[PDB]
Design a protein around this ligand. Structure first.
Ligand SMILES: CNS(=O)(=O)c1ccc(CNC(=O)c2cnc(OC)c3c2cnn3-c2ccc(F)cc2)cc1
Length: 256
């Protein structure tokens, strides 16, 4: 590894993100004045548990699909074997989405962008998972305080995805070398932009692991109560990543 190569990797990672960020930051920022009304919130609260879950499961799948395209565009990711690629995406995709979510979260009124408008925690009351929603809202609130940039999210998410500590990796050292280069790339950007201060302020080791395990646990409660709802109305990719291997992620990696 060399300096100008690490300098190229920073450009390679920010371009990958810029292309697959789903929604531009300004589009999210200009819609912050477009908040859900008291009557509009009540409507979501009056919706059935399974209809709210179906909508959330879809929006989360929409979000993950861009993370899968971001993965494919990452430097070195496609050089890894199909096993390692799936291993990393199965563990990473939901963590990356929760990191990216802080862009759609407005710290001032404590609201999040959802279905064209900004709404508080109460908009998801029908899901019957109060704790998880408040956990997701607080996490977004912590990353908001960090005053992140788009370039910073790009390099940080790339690191969240390329973790050599995931079980199931056959070519571990190949992931270890890519993780290292990406680590140096992120640290070099922070050093250049005089933003190394955020390193101590970043989320703890398994903070994101807690939100994902909470998300899988809260889904298993819903799947027990409504098994046919999940079988018939939930997105196939969502079921492969969170219900229980099916070969949907392989179809996404093989093409494009
Ligand atoms: C992720 N990329 S982005 O450009 O930042 C971006 C961000 C947001 C949106 C539109 N909002 C959402 O997708 C959304 C917002 N808030 C949520 O909850 C806090 C969501 C969302 C999707 N699933 N969930 C959710 C997850 C787990 C759960 F148990 C219940 C709901 C579009 C695009």
């Amino acid at each position: 590894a060399s300096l100008t190569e690490i300098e190229h990797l920073v450009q390679s990672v920010c371009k990958s993100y810029r292309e697959t960020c789903q929604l531009r930051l300004e589009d999210l920022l200009r819609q912050r004045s477009n908040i859900f009304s008291r009557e509009e919130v009540t409507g979501y609260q009056r919706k059935s548990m399974w209809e709210m879950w179906e909508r959330c499961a879809h929006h989360l799948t929409e979000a993950i699909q861009y993370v899968v395209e971001f993965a494919k565009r990452l430097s070195g990711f496609m050089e890894l074997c199909q096993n390692d690629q799936i291993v990393l995406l199965k563990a990473g995709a939901m963590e990356v989405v929760l990191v990216r979510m802080c862009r759609a979260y407005n710290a001032d009124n404590r609201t999040v962008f959802f279905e064209g408008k900004y709404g508080g925690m109460e908009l998801f009351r029908a899901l019957g998972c109060s704790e998880l929603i408040s956990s997701i809202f607080d996490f977004s609130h912590s990353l908001s305080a960090l005053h992140f940039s788009e370039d910073e999210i790009a390099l940080y998410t790339a690191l969240v995805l390329i973790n050599a500590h995931r079980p199931g990796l056959q070519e571990k050292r190949k992931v270890e070398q890519l993780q290292y280069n990406l680590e140096l790339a992120f640290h070099h950007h922070l050093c250049k932009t005089h933003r190394q201060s955020i390193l101590a302020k970043l989320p703890p080791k398994g903070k994101l692991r807690s939100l994902c395990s909470q998300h899988v646990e809260r889904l298993q409660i819903f799947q027990h109560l409504h098994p046919i709802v999940v079988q018939a109305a939930f997105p196939p990719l969502y079921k492969e990543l969170f219900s229980g291997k099916h070969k949907i992620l392989h179809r996404l990696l093989q093409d494009s």
